[PDB]
Amino acid sequence: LCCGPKLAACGIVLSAWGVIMLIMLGIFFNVHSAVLIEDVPFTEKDFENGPQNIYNLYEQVSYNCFIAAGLYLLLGGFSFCQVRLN
Amino acid sequence: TAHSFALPVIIFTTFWGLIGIAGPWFVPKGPNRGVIITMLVATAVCCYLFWLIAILAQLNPLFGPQLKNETIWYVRFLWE
Amino acid sequence: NNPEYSSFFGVMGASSAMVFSAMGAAYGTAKSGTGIAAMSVMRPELIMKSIIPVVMAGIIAIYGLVVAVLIANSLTDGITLYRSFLQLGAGLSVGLSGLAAGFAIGIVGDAGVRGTAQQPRLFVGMILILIFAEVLGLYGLIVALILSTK
Amino acid sequence: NNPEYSSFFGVMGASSAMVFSAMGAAYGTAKSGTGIAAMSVMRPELIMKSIIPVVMAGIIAIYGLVVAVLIANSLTDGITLYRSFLQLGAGLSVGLSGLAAGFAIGIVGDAGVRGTAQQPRLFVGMILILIFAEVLGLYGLIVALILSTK
Amino acid sequence: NNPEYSSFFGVMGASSAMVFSAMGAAYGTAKSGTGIAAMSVMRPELIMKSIIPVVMAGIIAIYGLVVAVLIANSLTDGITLYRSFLQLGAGLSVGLSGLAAGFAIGIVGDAGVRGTAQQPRLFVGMILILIFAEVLGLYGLIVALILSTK
Amino acid sequence: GQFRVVKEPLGFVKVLQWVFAIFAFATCGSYTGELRLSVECANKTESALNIEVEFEYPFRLHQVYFDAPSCVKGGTTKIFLVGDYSSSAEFFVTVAVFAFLYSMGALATYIFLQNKYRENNKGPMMDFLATAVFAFMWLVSSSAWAKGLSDVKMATDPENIIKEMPMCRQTGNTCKELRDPVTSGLNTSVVFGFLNLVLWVGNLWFVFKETGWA
Amino acid sequence: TYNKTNKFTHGFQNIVDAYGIGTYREINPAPYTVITFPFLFAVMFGDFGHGILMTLFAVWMVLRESRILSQKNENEMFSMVFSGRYIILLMGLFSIYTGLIYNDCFSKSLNIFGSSWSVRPMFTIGNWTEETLLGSSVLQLNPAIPGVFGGPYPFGIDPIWNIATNKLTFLNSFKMKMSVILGIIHMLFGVSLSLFNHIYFKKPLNIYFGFIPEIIFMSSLFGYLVILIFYKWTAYDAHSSRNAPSLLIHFINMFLFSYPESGNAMLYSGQKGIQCFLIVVAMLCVPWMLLFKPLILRHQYLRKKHVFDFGDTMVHQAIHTIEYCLGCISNTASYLRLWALSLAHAQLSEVLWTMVIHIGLHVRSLAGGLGLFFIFAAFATLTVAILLIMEGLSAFLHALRLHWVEFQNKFYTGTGFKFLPF
Ligand SMILES: CCCCCCCCCCCCCCCCCC(=O)OC[C@H](COP(=O)([O-])OCC[N+](C)(C)C)OC(=O)CCCCCCCCCCCCCCCCC
Ligand SMILES: CCCCCCCCCCCCCCCCCCCC(=O)O[C@H](COC(=O)CCCCCCCCCCCCCC)COP(=O)(O)OCCN
Ligand SMILES: CCCCCCCCCCCCCCCCCCCC(=O)O[C@H](COC(=O)CCCCCCCCCCCCCC)COP(=O)(O)OCCN
Ligand SMILES: CCCCCCCCCCCCCCCCCCCC(=O)O[C@H](COC(=O)CCCCCCCCCCCCCC)COP(=O)(O)OCCN
Ligand SMILES: CCCCCCCCCCCCCCCCCCCC(=O)O[C@H](COC(=O)CCCCCCCCCCCCCC)COP(=O)(O)OCCN
Ligand SMILES: CCCCCCCCCCCCCCCCCC(=O)OC[C@@H](O)COP(=O)(O)OCC[N+](C)(C)C
Ligand SMILES: CC(C)CCC[C@@H](C)[C@H]1CC[C@H]2[C@@H]3CC=C4C[C@@H](O)CC[C@]4(C)[C@H]3CC[C@]12C
Ligand SMILES: CC(C)CCC[C@@H](C)[C@H]1CC[C@H]2[C@@H]3CC=C4C[C@@H](O)CC[C@]4(C)[C@H]3CC[C@]12C
Ligand SMILES: CC(C)CCC[C@@H](C)[C@H]1CC[C@H]2[C@@H]3CC=C4C[C@@H](O)CC[C@]4(C)[C@H]3CC[C@]12C
Ligand SMILES: CC(C)CCC[C@@H](C)[C@H]1CC[C@H]2[C@@H]3CC=C4C[C@@H](O)CC[C@]4(C)[C@H]3CC[C@]12C
Ligand SMILES: CC(C)CCC[C@@H](C)[C@H]1CC[C@H]2[C@@H]3CC=C4C[C@@H](O)CC[C@]4(C)[C@H]3CC[C@]12C
Ligand SMILES: *[C@@H]1O[C@H](CO)[C@@H](O)[C@H](O)[C@H]1NC(C)=O
């Protein structure tokens, strides 16, 4: 699937940005950072007993971030293969 | 979480003073000695002023942060 | 027990539904009319084919009328203020959407009927634009119905 | 407590969302249409490629219809004045943002379709500007939703 | 406790923040667009360079959207008259500032696109003016952020 | 395989550095402490006769919490431990882990690629750089971890917890202790930290001799 | 005018030359601009993430500079950006620093040292209970009770303000004071450079009348304001919050001589007398500039040796004095542009985050990990389209404007010719 080198360069730079920033976001969520509390998809019931439920939700969002990072890793690999093609 | 205002002030003051005062004398002689020394001194002055303003604005607060009850509940458990 | 003035807004809706749309239609049937006449002097054979914008404008009026009749049938002596406001809003939506659609149809139809005398290939293009204008009135009607039958 | 007249504003929301947007779209469909009719006399081949401004005006009308129906499907009898004010604000935002976007699309699309007859390379340029106009309506829609679905 | 109409003004503020800003942006996106269409016939290579005014006009709209959202997310049912009128003031500030900034950007860009077509050296000059005009809208936004969070 | 290099004095030093700071990692990063207390209020039925809590190695004690008795109406109050010392414990454990990884790499190089290591005495040069860096790291971290262990003993001390407990400030309430954590693991960790400190201090001179600067 | 420009300093020399080539052998603003323009840009573009992106882009341009220099193209915008590759590199570095100071990274703080704000002392020493948390939607925090506020954050703004709804309340004051402080200090540095100019050109008349009145006026009126800002920061605390005066009202009263017996008390003992003395010196600095120099020029060039036209000289000096006196005020006001642009950038980044990637992060199901893909791309492009390119351009041009007008008006003339060799 040959394409213009400019698009491949944009794809690889976006892939690097996504991988780095989403890996950092996943690490920060998994650390249960309070700064990102607003992004955690919790509900009222989660404030019943203790913070363990919110910790689990933090971990779930971190897993989502890592999945996004992996998808962007695949995208960057595709872009690098296209660059090697060109 | 007692952030004493002695280690930060001493450390940053001495660091930026060494960069802005001691730094110029260590710049190797050459065509760019003057511009490099100006860069050193100006960076020291600007960065130290910015950090000093930032730290002093927080010293002696006249009111505390307004935190939602959800984030207050979380912060009680999490933060020190 | 409902306010005696509640029906007022209702009738306004109906009246508006048939006035503004009519006004819009008039503009259409006016502007296109002129264009058609200006075209007929040179290319008479395009008269019938060029009556399309007028028809479009006419359809806009129909929308208005339809909604008006709807409202004009949903009026009752004890019509609640909520339903009266709903009918007024439906009338406003249909009437003013038909007004804007009629203005657009008039302008586009005049321009396209004048052009089709010079470039026949423009005919189809004009038609598309007219539809894109006509649908505007349709949208109003849709919303009107949603408000009127709510 | 939930006055008898609370629904009025909400209704005037839906109508607004459908009316003003339509007006904007009509303008976008009208002005652009004239330009196409002017351009197509000399450059027939660009007539179909140059209908994009009309499509964008229609999309503005679709934004208006979306918000108008989303409001009309939330007008309960005892709608609180707060919710009715929210619906009026959403309708005004979507409708008048769509009106401004319709003005912008009309001017830009007409100028671009007439210029593209001279310099084809302007086409892409025009499209970009049209997008920058279209997003304006989109912005309104966004805010409208944020108000209406609140 | 608080009047049942207290939420009206704030809502209008939000809508105003979206509407007037959009209008401003629209005018810009129109005027600059016209200028580009006039320039691009002789100097096609400058279309991308000369699209900066439109972008700045778009930025104005964004500011309004921001404030609108910032007000549309803060409207509570028991919104006091104090908060309601704070949000109204923020909305008026951002909306009218964006309107004026959009007018200035449109006029200056419509002049400067043609000027840069004539004299390339004016390009940077045009920009040096546009940003000034743009920040006028920004100033409004700033005051809005001061008000709606007072 | 240049296994004889392992048997050399510097090979022995590297092996010891490998096995130690693995002992420290196992003893510190694997620590899990437990505290048990009891309270007999004025009303015996409201007594918290058995309260149990558990904490882990990172010593983020301020997060650790438990529902102590209120001694009034049978209610409970949430109480959190005082302060954390992860700044010291994590620092020490990371230092030990880095030492273990570097020692494993150095042992592999000595066994397989000692010729390249000794080439130009540059391998010894980076060895001396790392030796000085690790000596400074151990010097700071051993003291940091010792102070952290002392403060841990103070804070986790059920006596201090009860001292800060507002229960004893009421009438009749008696708060007493039931268990104490195992302090052998942390003392062993600090002892092994000092052992690693002295090991790297000795390695300084050996690397100096190898690099030819002696 | 010949400056012996270098590869690194070419960007800044062209930047300072755009408003007018400096006269023959006058204090060049290029060496000081090399740092104060990236810094005044970072004060507005303060963001760790956007600073990182800008630094990486500028480093890419620098490393591959030879390739693009060889491979020339006609893209005016790219050529302009590339010519300022070093300017952009320095701007990115200083923006990284300021974003660290602002504790901002894509609109999110860091908390690498630990916040000074503990909520537990509210529950322990304060009256709070879980009931109060349940009953209050937003509540607040107070440092008056002992353990809530454990000193200032060692480096940069405390992270808690990111999650505090009182964020803007504090940040507006902090950034307004920062902008005014930096502006006044920059203008004072400009006036000192004007003194250097006068000394080199051997114009003692300007030194004794001119520079000295200018510096006395500026320092007494506005340097005193910086002193007041710093003193209020050091002195008033949470306990004395109730009677903490507003420096805006105090400055206005100083100008109006409206020291009242009611309202906020004096910042310090003897404020009335000291402020009256400062105001008197400030006004006297006006006649000092206006009347003196024309009279001495007339005396020494029309009474001695005997075209000089006293009326026009007096008019010109009056225009210069009016310009400078109104300029001090209008420039101290204009330097608030730093706070305005910084707050706008911060709020636009915040709204972009919460409107784009809050959608992808606020999803319970694991399938959201796929959504975060597409959403993120939009975020990324937006952060490159609105923030990095447009807000960055605005901040760049406004730092430029601050340097051209507010800073260089104190010492720069710019009435020379560029040295165009053969
Ligand atoms: C991934 C994205 C990361 C972010 C990167 C972008 C950051 C946003 C801000 C960039 C602004 C760039 C402008 C400054 C650089 C030019 C200054 C310089 O050194 O050149 C002296 C320039 C051009 O160089 P010159 O040709 O005069 O060089 C001197 C040559 N002799 C001596 C022979 C005459 O000279 C001037 O005219 C001086 C005044 C410049 C004032 C700048 C006006 C604004 C320009 C806007 C640029 C375009 C917008 C960005 C578009 C990006 C999309 C492609
Ligand atoms: C309250 C906060 C603000 C405070 C700001 C003012 C205080 C800082 C500046 C005070 C003055 C510093 C010293 C002035 C220069 C003295 C000359 C000797 C300097 C030196 O050792 O380097 C020479 C080169 O210097 C040179 O080439 C010139 C060096 C110039 C240094 C000063 C420039 C930075 C000032 C801007 C500050 C930042 C902005 C503030 C908002 C070497 O001698 P040589 O052999 O090179 O011979 C000279 C020409 N070649
Ligand atoms: C992230 C937190 C920190 C942010 C704040 C600090 C930011 C500092 C930014 C300056 C650093 C980058 C300098 C440019 C690097 C590229 C070099 C370009 C070429 C070069 O060597 O330039 C020379 C000019 O001096 C120079 O290039 C100057 C180099 C020495 C500068 C010393 C001052 C640095 C700042 C203070 C110390 C560090 C503080 C932070 C810890 C002369 O060009 P040439 O002769 O090579 O040209 C060859 C053709 N003629
Ligand atoms: C359901 C639908 C909604 C129901 C509610 C609406 C009820 C009906 C009332 C609205 C008006 C209906 C009548 C239509 C007016 C036709 C306008 C024609 C405009 C026109 O061409 O006239 C221009 C003058 O404008 C004018 O003179 C403007 C028109 C005159 C004003 C009309 C109002 C009269 C005042 C009312 C008094 C009572 C108020 C209550 C106390 C002349 O154009 P040019 O300037 O180029 O001339 C140059 C050549 N001569
Ligand atoms: C090129 C650079 C150009 C210059 C740029 C800087 C701007 C200069 C501005 C004018 C000169 C300096 C400022 C003079 C105005 C008074 C300053 C007062 C500062 C202040 O708040 O201090 C408090 C008053 O001090 C006292 O209680 C002591 C008595 C009152 C103050 C006496 C005068 C001190 C300043 C001496 C001149 C410095 C000249 C600097 C250029 C501390 O007092 P507290 O809080 O402990 O007491 C309070 C309960 N009683
Ligand atoms: C294209 C080029 C590449 C671009 C690169 C961009 C990189 C951007 C990545 C980051 C973006 C997201 C920012 C979010 C930052 C918040 C994370 C945070 O707060 O961190 C710290 C938390 O982990 C801990 O804090 P805590 O648990 O609350 O407190 C405990 C803290 N003690 C232990 C120090 C007391
Ligand atoms: C088709 C042209 C002539 C335009 C006129 C449209 C007329 C004939 C038709 C088309 C759509 C129809 C409406 C479609 C839906 C509704 C809502 C439903 O609950 C009852 C009837 C009602 C209100 C219909 C009435 C008649 C109607 C308005
Ligand atoms: C040109 C013509 C064919 C267009 C369509 C006819 C329109 C104008 C009229 C004629 C008869 C009308 C219907 C007659 C009776 C009723 C029942 C009433 O409870 C609701 C409105 C409703 C359903 C009317 C809707 C509008 C209607 C369909
Ligand atoms: C191509 C067709 C479907 C559209 C053109 C005709 C329009 C006017 C008609 C066709 C079907 C109609 C809908 C059918 C049913 C209802 C449900 C009723 O409670 C509100 C009105 C509403 C929502 C009608 C609105 C008007 C409507 C959309
Ligand atoms: C059918 C295709 C061609 C669409 C053409 C017209 C569009 C605008 C019309 C046709 C059918 C309409 C829908 C029919 C029924 C309902 C439910 C009703 O409570 C209100 C709105 C809603 C959801 C309508 C929205 C508008 C609608 C989608
Ligand atoms: C003729 C065509 C092009 C008209 C536009 C397309 C129509 C079919 C679609 C597009 C998006 C749709 C809207 C999307 C969401 C909602 C919200 C829901 O609560 C009521 C229906 C409503 C408001 C829909 C009505 C029909 C709608 C407007
Ligand atoms: C109650 O509240 C006041 C005001 O915040 C506080 O100062 C005081 O210490 C509290 N008293 C208690 C909890 O007894």
From Swiss-Prot, chain B:
It is found in: Membrane; Cytoplasmic vesicle, Clathrin-coated vesicle membrane; Cytoplasmic vesicle, Secretory vesicle, Synaptic vesicle membrane. Keywords: Cytoplasmic vesicle, Glycoprotein, Hydrogen ion transport, Ion transport, Membrane, Synapse, Transmembrane, Transmembrane helix, Transport. It is a multi-pass membrane protein. Glycans are attached at residue 69. GO terms for molecular function: proton-transporting ATPase activity, rotational mechanism. Expressed in brain (at protein level). GO terms for biological process: proton transmembrane transport; synaptic vesicle lumen acidification; transmembrane transport. Residues 1-6, 56-80 are lumenal. The keyword Transport applies. Its main location: membrane. Pfam families: ATP_synt_H. The chain crosses the membrane at residues 7-27, 35-55. Residues 28-34 are cytoplasmic. One of its GO terms (cellular component) is clathrin-coated vesicle membrane. The keyword Transport applies. Subunit of the V0 complex of vacuolar(H+)-ATPase (V-ATPase), a multisubunit enzyme composed of a peripheral complex (V1) that hydrolyzes ATP and a membrane integral complex (V0) that translocates protons. V-ATPase is responsible for acidifying and maintaining the pH of intracellular compartments and in some cell types, is targeted to the plasma membrane, where it is responsible for acidifying the extracellular environment. Belongs to the V-ATPase e1/e2 subunit family. This is V-type proton ATPase subunit e 2. It comes from Rattus norvegicus. The gene is Atp6v0e2.
Swiss-Prot record, chains C, D, E:
One of its GO terms (cellular component) is synaptic vesicle membrane. Proton-conducting pore forming subunit of the V0 complex of vacuolar(H+)-ATPase (V-ATPase), a multisubunit enzyme composed of a peripheral complex (V1) that hydrolyzes ATP and a membrane integral complex (V0) that translocates protons. V-ATPase is responsible for acidifying and maintaining the pH of intracellular compartments and in some cell types, is targeted to the plasma membrane, where it is responsible for acidifying the extracellular environment. This is V-type proton ATPase 16 kDa proteolipid subunit c. Ubiquitinated by RNF182, leading to its degradation via the ubiquitin-proteasome pathway. The lineage of its organism: Eukaryota, Metazoa, Chordata, Craniata, Vertebrata. Residues 72-87, 148-150 are lumenal. It comes from Rattus norvegicus (Rat). It comes from the Eukaryota. The keyword Membrane applies.
Curated annotation (Swiss-Prot), chain F:
The modification Phosphothreonine is found at residue 211. One of its GO terms (biological process) is endocytosis. The modification Phosphotyrosine is found at residue 65. It is a multi-pass membrane protein. Keywords: Calcium, Cytoplasmic vesicle, Glycoprotein, Membrane, Phosphoprotein, Repeat, Synapse, Synaptosome, Transmembrane, Transmembrane helix, Ubl conjugation. The chain crosses the membrane at residues 10-33, 92-115, 123-146, 185-208. Ubiquitinated; mediated by SIAH1 or SIAH2 and leading to its subsequent proteasomal degradation. Residues 34-91, 147-184 are vesicular. One of its GO terms (molecular function) is SH2 domain binding. Residues 5-212 form the MARVEL domain. One of its GO terms (cellular component) is perinuclear region of cytoplasm. Possibly involved in structural functions as organizing other membrane components or in targeting the vesicles to the plasma membrane. Involved in the regulation of short-term and long-term synaptic plasticity. Homohexamer or homotetramer. Interacts with SRCIN1. Interacts with VAMP2; the interaction is inhibited by interaction of VAPM2 with SEPT8. This is Synaptophysin. It comes from Rattus norvegicus (Rat). The chain holds residues 11 to 224 of 307 of the full protein.
From Swiss-Prot, chain G:
The modification Phosphotyrosine is found at residue 2. The keyword Aminoacyl-tRNA synthetase does not apply. The chain crosses the membrane at residues 27-45, 48-64, 80-109, 174-193, 212-232, 278-297, 322-346, 368-406. GO terms for biological process: regulation of macroautophagy; synaptic vesicle lumen acidification; vacuolar acidification. Residues 65-79, 194-211 are cytoplasmic. The keyword Nucleotide-binding does not apply. GO terms for molecular function: ATPase binding; proton-transporting ATPase activity, rotational mechanism. Residues 46-47, 110-173, 233-277, 347-367 are vacuolar. GO terms for cellular component: clathrin-coated vesicle membrane; cytoplasm; melanosome; membrane; perinuclear region of cytoplasm; plasma membrane; synaptic vesicle membrane; terminal bouton. Its main location: membrane. Disulfide bonds: none annotated. It is found in: Cytoplasmic vesicle, Clathrin-coated vesicle membrane; Cytoplasmic vesicle, Secretory vesicle, Synaptic vesicle membrane; Melanosome. It is a multi-pass membrane protein. Keywords: Cytoplasmic vesicle, Hydrogen ion transport, Ion transport, Membrane, Phosphoprotein, Synapse, Transmembrane, Transmembrane helix, Transport. Belongs to the V-ATPase 116 kDa subunit family. This is V-type proton ATPase 116 kDa subunit a 1. It comes from Rattus norvegicus (Rat). The gene is Atp6v0a1. The chain holds residues 363 to 826 of 838 of the full protein.
